[PDB]
Each structure stands twice: as structure tokens, then as C-alpha cells.
Design a protein around this ligand. Structure first.
Ligand SMILES: NC(=O)c1ncn([C@@H]2O[C@H](COP(=O)(O)OP(=O)(O)OP(=O)(O)O)[C@@H](O)[C@H]2O)n1
Ligand SMILES: NC(=O)c1ncn([C@@H]2O[C@H](COP(=O)(O)OP(=O)(O)OP(=O)(O)O)[C@@H](O)[C@H]2O)n1
Ligand SMILES: NC(=O)c1ncn([C@@H]2O[C@H](COP(=O)(O)OP(=O)(O)OP(=O)(O)O)[C@@H](O)[C@H]2O)n1
Ligand SMILES: NC(=O)c1ncn([C@@H]2O[C@H](COP(=O)(O)OP(=O)(O)OP(=O)(O)O)[C@@H](O)[C@H]2O)n1
Ligand SMILES: NC(=O)c1ncn([C@@H]2O[C@H](COP(=O)(O)OP(=O)(O)OP(=O)(O)O)[C@@H](O)[C@H]2O)n1
Ligand SMILES: NC(=O)c1ncn([C@@H]2O[C@H](COP(=O)(O)OP(=O)(O)OP(=O)(O)O)[C@@H](O)[C@H]2O)n1
Ligand SMILES: [Mg+2]
Ligand SMILES: [Mg+2]
Ligand SMILES: [Mg+2]
Ligand SMILES: [Mg+2]
Ligand SMILES: [Mg+2]
Ligand SMILES: [Mg+2]
Lengths: 150, 150, 150, 150, 150, 150
């Protein structure tokens, strides 16, 4: 359905490097609709809950550390196959290996500072969305451009 | 001081036309820092409180009406003389009379649908900011690029 | 009713310098609608008819000469106060004196090679439009973004 | 030889979403030359003739339907291997599966509304060109930037 | 004559904020030709010689100080009325008072950190050029796009 | 330690087509730091020394010929894995086969006129760097954005 939603977040480096507008603009141009948007400073709780799947990973330390060292602009986009498309537009985990045209490919160089993050599946999305947004912080009335869908 | 803050809001038409990223990007490029950011649907209360100065104005009707017909992404930018600069970057009330290069000048044509709004004075700002954001929704730790100020 | 239409034309230098897309994109971004569009090579007739008002002027020679030395993409845009707005976005006759942000201001340096031309009044428009386009080469069903006007 | 030509067309959704300039600009930047350009509203004849190869596929219905629901800006570009290159710049049939950087990859989400179409072979080109343009609507004197070729 | 040349320099903050390409790109788009280009770290000598006219003003101190705190990419552009046009594209001394569309207007906020500097007269140019470049570091064979001039 | 440096050069066609700013801007946006930058006209010596590996190749003739037919802006960028990343951003030898988003993919069409060149290995880099720049023409104090690496 055209109501699939994904969770995306501009990490501290992204926000600090002034890439918030640029990134949002890409998804707006793609046709996806913004249903949730806000800036905050992740709490160590939220951080570990979010990256829960890596708690036993060597990098989990600095990750949670960094992810809370400054503001993060979290957002939710809605659209047909947005979860898979958003990832594609982001690139791969290593910015250096990301193709030109993708977000990481155009702006990053270090795996630790890769500008943005986003849900890797509809499952992970729903979870991460609920985890970061309160029900009333998300639109319900989503009306996209009529020139978008058939 | 370099801690001046202004209130800016992408009106429904702006948000609907997909200009959120583009607009934010301009202020980020200018050097101003994002201290507050969120999307919501203005309530008739907030609407009238915001445009309180025009309650006796002929257009006050449709204004408050429209301003709540859909999502609005409100935001707060901080920086040296941001209130006056932000207005300058916006243009004048009538998009048609706004110079190329300014936001309204580049995207609008109707006074009723002029993409964005912003505080016209430090006074109006403080008021509008407090009016739209809750104290904890705004950063306190604002560290701009060091290449920005002397 | 606000369907005012204007005639704009990317002169040979503009077309040759590959600025067609760029220029169209600006007016599209502004909100104006494209009702007529085509590329051709002006005939000495059309040329003199077009610049009829300068037939006794000392430059009329090279003008008509140049304006037909290569392709020209003529177009018609429709929208509220488009004639005046389009001129504003173009700049002034001398590119060097045109402000940054305007078309001539951003791309030209010589009065003889100023990238684009456009009707300077609703009168001149109607005349120039009819002069360059055949009635069936122009849309009649013009439906703009429902977010542009109120 | 650098005389190869291809047929490209901004479909109604593309035109309606205001992507005409943007798209033309990409091909101009690539180095290809514009030999034919015009806006029109496809007739059911032209439509079926164009998509003749799909008269049986379960989508031929809505396709021809849509392709004529509004203006389309058809165009012809000339240059070394333009047919294959143009397709590459477009992406694949499904916008969601198209890579960032390509036209569909950057602007579309639905297979039915994929912004643009273009000849898939020199054969299909010649046919589609002749089908859409009258001989005198195409330049013959094509002089590209000298810096493009060896 | 279209031989006029001006001296422009991206100051340390500009270079540090990664605006070198962006700035050069503007002048290239305008039609001016690059005759000299290089990156270096101004010496206190060069610095004071350059800003010789301000040796008394209360800011000459930090100015010379800053202008040598890091790399600077100096450059020379050639073209009809380039000195006046370049300044226009830069804006005014105070970035906050510079119009959107101009370099300072779009990227700076502090008079002390105004991204770029440029000769304010043909006189000042010749002097500053000779002062920063060695005769063989400047082209002599300057051939601009033929579409720029009449 | 990640100060890997690479040598890149905007060939005559690139410089002539006015793509210098655009190209530099991409690498600046990527996060790489500019350590060396200058414009010159390659001497037949430098040319053959540079393309030494192709002296017996059938194209070596016109190559060296062209590479010295006009100005070239040589530059050195420093950053984590810059040599491999820079190549990726450039595309493949044939512009037509280069993906959208890469430099050649977006601007070139002919293998002979492919806008830019860059070291294909750390080995080739060191060699080409030393070959094109004098030790004091390269920075030593390289301080990148503190947000780029962890
Ligand atoms: N050194 C490594 O092997 C490694 N893997 C991940 N990381 C850092 O941790 C974040 C999450 O890792 P993931 O494997 O989920 O990658 P991702 O899917 O691209 O990231 P995200 O969840 O933040 O969108 C990554 O975004 C990155 O900052 N380092
Ligand atoms: N028809 C009129 O004369 C008129 N004046 C204002 N308006 C609509 O009401 C909004 C607020 O008016 P203001 O005079 O405050 O203009 P503004 O300062 O540019 O707007 P804002 O407060 O929304 O930033 C305007 O932004 C516009 O949408 N119509
Ligand atoms: N040297 C002069 O004083 C002079 N005045 C005009 N011109 C050339 O002639 C074209 C037509 O003159 P106009 O005064 O009508 O220019 P415009 O109103 O700015 O633009 P356009 O005619 O092309 O729509 C101009 O666009 C320009 O190329 N040279
Ligand atoms: N639902 C489907 O399975 C399907 N297949 C095609 N389509 C729509 O019909 C157009 C023509 O199909 P093609 O396979 O020829 O697409 P194309 O090669 O990418 O583009 P075009 O014909 O429009 O140049 C496509 O561009 C697309 O709009 N829908
Ligand atoms: N605080 C002040 O009153 C003041 N005045 C000048 N400045 C700094 O010194 C630079 C030189 O002053 P100018 O008045 O010559 O500025 P300009 O004409 O815009 O630029 P430039 O000399 O750097 O080409 C200015 O560009 C600016 O960085 N601060
Ligand atoms: N026709 C051919 O098969 C052929 N191969 C190379 N060339 C021309 O010679 C330049 C140098 O060849 P390379 O294979 O080293 O190219 P590259 O590695 O992609 O780039 P560069 O040498 O310029 O850094 C190429 O950039 C290209 O202009 N033509
Ligand atoms: Mg993950
Ligand atoms: Mg107001
Ligand atoms: Mg006129
Ligand atoms: Mg097909
Ligand atoms: Mg000065
Ligand atoms: Mg090589």
C-alpha cells in the first residue's frame, strides 16, 4: 500500500554539517510525504533502545555515545515502498563505498559519521517510529500529490 | 548578540508544494542554527493568537482558516541579526513584488499563498516563539560553525 | 480571473549555452504554467515583426541578424501578473547591471547577448504571442497547482 | 557517428509536477543537442500508435488513457550514443528501483506515473521521432560545443 | 574592452566552510574567464600590503591576523566590466545587509567573516593582481565563449 | 592516520566548458580537503611524464596534444580513502558508460573529452602529485571538519 512509512534520522554530524534541508529536500522531490518531523537530543535510553540490535557489537559503545552528543532531527516519511527506497537513496553503511547520487555517497567518508540513518525494514520501521514519535506527533490525514500515484 | 532567535513557519502551501527542505537549506547555508523544529496542524486558537494583530483586518478570516487547513512546519533559528535577515531572505508580503533570490520571489505568486512566514521583530519573535514552542523543545546548547563569527 | 500570459524566448546564445532547461525550471518553480512551447529558427520576417518597435534604432540591424542566426525556443507562460513578474526575473536590458538572482544577472555580460527576452506589457504580450504561436499550439485547459492561488 | 537521435517525452505527471526545465537541463548538461521541442496534448491515435507494442498488455488501457489526460512536452536530442545514454539517465521502468541520480530514481515512485519516457533503441527512435515530429520541426544544422568531441 | 580583470579571494572562513567550488561556479556561469587561480597561506607581509588602505582603522589588526590564519584561494577573472560585476555578485561589506542571491547575502552573517573579497576598482585590481600573482601565473591567451559577446 | 591524498585535474574541455567550480564543489561537499590548487598550461614534458604509462598506446598522440592545448586546473585533495573515492565520483573512462551522479556521467559523452582525470592508486598519486606540485605549493597543516571523522 501507499501508506508504508519509514523512520529516518539526520545524525549529529549531518545536523552539524548543515545538511538537514538538503536531505529533506531529496525525499520531498522523490514524492514521499512528511508525516512526522522534530529535532531533539537523544537520551541514552532512546539511543540504546534504537540500536538495540547492536548492544553486543564492538561499536555499540561509541555509537550510542555519539548519537546523543548533540541534536538529531528525526522524521517519518510515508509513501509506496518508502522503506526500501529511502535506504537506496541513503547508500550503504560505508559512505566511501556509497555511489554518487546517494546521500552518504555525496556527503560522507567515515562509517562512524555517516550523516543519516533509516529503518531497514517495515518491521524495524514500525518499531522505530513508535519508539521515537508519540501518536499525535504523526499526521493521519496524508494527501500526496495526485500526479504521484495511479 | 549572536543569540538572537526568530520564528519561521512554512505555511500549508509551502509544505504541500514540497518546499520544506529547500527553505531550511537556505537558512542552514546562511549560517543560522536550528534550535527548534516540528510539524503540526495549527489549532484555531494558536492561529488567532499568532495573527492576533490582524483580527480586525479583512483577510483575518481566510488567513486563520487556511493556516489550519493543513500541516505547518514551525521552526526557530538562532544567529546574529537573524530576525531581520530572515525577513530579507523571505521577501515582501506580495510574492509577485519579491525579488528573485528571496523565498517568495522564487516560489510564490499570490499574497494569500506566500509559502512562508516569519517574525518581523525581536519582540514579535519572543512572543511567537513562546507561543509555538515549549521550553524543552528548544536547544540551549547552541554551538555554531567557528568560521561564522569573529 | 488571473490567466495573464506572457511571451518569453530563449535567444540563440541562451540556447547555444545550454540554458534552456535552467530558464524553464525557474518559471516552473515560480508557479507559472507552460501553455506554449517550441523551438524554431526565426525568419527575417518574424524577426522584424517581433522587434518592429526598434526598426529605426541603430542596433536593429545586428539584432534581427543575430535573432535568426540559430534556434530559439519560444514559450508562453500563464499566471497571475506573469508579464511583470517574468520581466523582474529576467533583470534589466544590460546583464551587467542585472541583480544576482535574475536570469541575466546570473548568466550574461553583454547587452547584445542577453540570453532571453520577454514581453514588457500585456499589450506587447498578446501581440507577440499571436505573432509567434498558432491558436492550436496553445493550451486552453490550464489547471495550475491548487496550492498556488486562494 | 554523433548524429544519433532519440525521442524523449515528459509525460503529464512530469509536466504537472513542474519537472520540464529540470529534465531538459540534465540532457543539456550532458552535452546532447536539442533538435526538436514542443508541447501538445496527445490524441488517442498518436497514443496508441506510440505504445503500439503494448496493445495487448493489461496496462495498455490506462496507459493510453493517461498519456492523453494532459500536456506532454515531446523532444528530440542528438548526440553520440544518445539513445542508450538517455535511457541510462532515465533509470528503469519502476521508479522505486531506479538509482539515485537518474531521473526516475530522483522523482518518481509509481510505475504508472514515471515522469518521462524515451526510445529504447535507434529503431524505436526513428520510428517514434517521425511519428511525433514533422520534418521541418527538427533542426538540420546541428552544431554542438566543440569541447564535447575529439 | 572585455579584457578588464579583477582580483578575488576566498578568505579562510570561505575556504574552511567549503564554498570554493560554489563561488568559482558563480563567476564561471556569469561568463567571466579564469586567468589565474591558486591556494596559499598569506604572509603577514602580503596581508598588510593587500589591506594597506586600512592600516589605521581599528580592525586592521584582526583583519591581517585572520587573513593569514589559514589557506586562501586567490583568483583572477577576466571579462567586460568584471570588477564592478564581481563586487555586485559579492554583496556589501556586511553579509547581513547583503541581498539574497549575492555571495555574502547567501552565506555570511558577520562582517569579520564575510567569505570573500574582491577589488573595488580597476586601479585596486591591477595593484592587487600584481601584488598576488607572478606574470607567468596568469594566462595571456584568453578565449571566452563566442556566445558571450557581440 | 588517514591523510591519503590524490591528484585530480580538470582537463581543457572541462575548464573550457566552465565546470571548474562545479567539480571542486563536489569534492568539498564530500568532505575532502583541498591541499593544493592551481591553473596552468601543461608543457609537452609534463604531459608525457604524466601519461607516461600510455606512450606506446595509439591514443597517446592526441592525448598529450590536447592536454596541452589549453589551461588545466590541477588540484590535490586529502582525506580517508580519497584516491578510490575520487575515482568513483568521476565514473569510468567512457563518459557514456558512466552512471548518472558521477562527474563524467553527468557532463561528458566522448572518451577523448572526459572533463577530468585523477590518480588511480596511492602509488600513481604520490608520483603524479610530486610531478605536478612543488612541496611548498601543498598545505601541511590540514584540519578538516571535526564532524567528518570519529
Ligand atoms: N563499524 C561498523 O561495522 C559499523 N556498522 C555500523 N556502524 C555505525 O552504527 C550505525 C548502525 O549500523 P547498521 O549496521 O544498522 O547500519 P545502518 O543500517 O546503515 O545504520 P542506521 O541503522 O543508523 O540507519 C551505522 O549507521 C554506523 O554509524 N559502524
Ligand atoms: N491581503 C493583504 O493585504 C494581506 N496581508 C497579509 N496577508 C496574509 O496574512 C499574512 C500575514 O500578514 P502580514 O502583514 O503579517 O505579512 P507577513 O509579515 O509577510 O506575514 P507572516 O506574519 O505570516 O510572516 C501574510 O503572510 C499573507 O498570507 N494578506
Ligand atoms: N545597445 C542597446 O542600447 C540595446 N538595447 C537593446 N538591445 C538589444 O535589443 C533587444 C531588444 O531591446 P529591448 O529594449 O526591447 O529589450 P528588452 O525589452 O530588455 O528585451 P526583449 O526585447 O528581448 O524582450 C535587447 O534584449 C538587446 O539584446 N541593445
Ligand atoms: N504496470 C506495468 O507493468 C507497466 N509497464 C509499463 N507501464 C507504463 O507504461 C509505459 C510503457 O512501458 P515500457 O515498458 O515501454 O516503459 P519504458 O520503456 O520505461 O518507457 P516509455 O515507453 O514510456 O518510453 C511505462 O513507462 C510505464 O509508465 N506500466
Ligand atoms: N568591522 C568593520 O567595520 C570592518 N570593515 C571591514 N572589515 C573586514 O575587513 C575587510 C576589508 O574591508 P573593506 O571595507 O575593504 O571590505 P570589502 O571591500 O568588502 O572587501 P575586501 O577588501 O576584503 O575585498 C572586509 O571585507 C571585512 O572582512 N571589518
Ligand atoms: N580510447 C581509449 O580507449 C582511451 N583510453 C584512454 N583515453 C584517454 O586517455 C586518458 C588517460 O587514460 P586512462 O585509462 O589513464 O584514463 P583514466 O584513468 O580514466 O583517467 P586519467 O588518466 O585521465 O586520470 C583518458 O582519460 C581518456 O581521455 N582514451
Ligand atoms: Mg541499523
Ligand atoms: Mg505578520
Ligand atoms: Mg522589449
Ligand atoms: Mg518502452
Ligand atoms: Mg575593500
Ligand atoms: Mg589513469
Amino acid at each position: 500500500v501507499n501508506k508504508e512509512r519509514t523512520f529516518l534520522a539526520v545524525k549529529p554530524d549531518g545536523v552539524a554539517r548543515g545538511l538537514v534541508g538538503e536531505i529533506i529536500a531529496r525525499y520531498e522531490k522523490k514524492g514521499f510525504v512528511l508525516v512526522g518531523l522534530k529535532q531533539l537530543v537523544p537520551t541514552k535510553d532512546l539511543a540504546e533502545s534504537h540500536y538495540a540490535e547492536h548492544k553486543e557489537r564492538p561499536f555499540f559503545g561509541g555509537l550510542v555515545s555519539f548519537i546523543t552528543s548533540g541534536p538529531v532531527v528525526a522524521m517519518v516519511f510515508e509513501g509506496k515502498g518508502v522503506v526500501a527506497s529511502a535506504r537506496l537513496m541513503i547508500g550503504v553503511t560505508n559512505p566511501l563505498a556509497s555511489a554518487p547520487g546517494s546521500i552518504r555517497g555525496d556527503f560522507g567518508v567515515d562509517v562512524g559519521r555517516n550523516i543519516i540513518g533509516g529503518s531497514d525494514s517495515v518491521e524495524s520501521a514500525n518499531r522505530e517510529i513508535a519508539l521515537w514519535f508519540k501518536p499525535e506527533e504523526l499526521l493521519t490525514e496524508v494527501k500526496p500529490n495526485p500526479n504521484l500515484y495511479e
